[PDB]
């Protein structure tokens, strides 16, 4: 996360950390949607261009963490993966269209003051909240600047959703209806962006009607980080809700 700040403890209890077992490595962010299901970006698990194709046994997820590194004994929870489900139409070849994956944990996690699921949007939420100009919130332990350091505490940044034509004209990469972009425009007085390593993390919004947080997007891709005239791209969670439901109902 670039130009964000340290999160308050328990501010994002659905935050999940995707960890490679060997060598030990922080791969991406993810989010808790139930006691057995974690949502993340497909490219965090499968990306052939980078010779990346992790299987269940190669990974572990960490839930309830605040610091990056510090062992938060009996607060954080480490879970094994029972199964990985990547969207069948995930386009790793061209533009990361449908950059989404689900991970089912071997055992249900116990919720706590630091571990709690986020809501997934329904039609009404998507229609009312995913509008240009409204701000959402992105969190992650990814890069603090465009590079190639890393934060010691989870970072958070609030960013406004950008009009689709502007997202489209800001890049030569083909954008789709399964993505949305966010970030401030040049000279608006504020900056900020997700960055490498933040993928899989949630872009959430708080409903003004019921006080609940909904995960509207998944950090997916960008070009550089926090560059003027460029915007971060996110997987449009509601556009892919039907697939999410299908997997959870079927397993």
């Amino acid at each position: 996360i670039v130009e964000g700040s340290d999160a308050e403890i328990g501010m994002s209890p659905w935050q999940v950390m995707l960890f490679r077992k060997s060598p030990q490595e922080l791969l991406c962010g993810a989010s808790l949607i139930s006691d057995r299901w974690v949502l993340t970006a497909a490219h965090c698990l499968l990306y052939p261009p980078w010779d990346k194709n992790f299987t269940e046994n190669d990974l572990l997820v960490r839930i309830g963490k605040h610091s990056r590194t510090r062992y938060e004994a009996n607060i954080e929870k480490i879970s094994m993966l029972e199964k990985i489900y990547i969207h069948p139409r995930y386009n790793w070849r061209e533009n990361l269209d449908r950059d989404i994956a689900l991970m089912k944990l071997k055992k249900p996690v116990a919720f706590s003051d630091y571990i709690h699921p986020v809501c997934l949007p329904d039609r009404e939420t998507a229609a009312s909240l995913l509008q240009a100009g409204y701000k959402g919130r992105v969190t992650g332990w990814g890069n603090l600047k465009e590079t190639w350091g890393q934060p010691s505490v989870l970072q958070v940044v609030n960013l406004p959703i950008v009009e689709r034509p502007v997202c489209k004209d800001s890049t030569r990469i083909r954008i789709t209806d399964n993505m949305f972009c966010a970030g401030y425009k040049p000279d608006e007085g504020k900056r900020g962006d997700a960055c490498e390593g933040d993928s899989g993390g949630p872009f959430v919004m708080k409903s003004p009607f019921n006080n609940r947080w909904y995960q509207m997007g998944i950090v997916s891709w960008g070009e550089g980080c926090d560059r003027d005239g460029k915007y971060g791209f996110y997987t449009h969670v509601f556009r892919l809700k039907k697939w999410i439901q299908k997997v959870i109902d079927q397993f």
Binding site: G10, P13, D113, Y114, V118, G136, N158, M205, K206, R212
Partner: peptide
Amino acid sequence: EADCGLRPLFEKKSLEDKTERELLESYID
């Protein structure tokens, strides 16, 4: 929706985090 999206240390305790107001005000601006 059960209990989804209501944070034990914030919504459940009627406490606002430091910047959520920025998000709510953005629905206007």
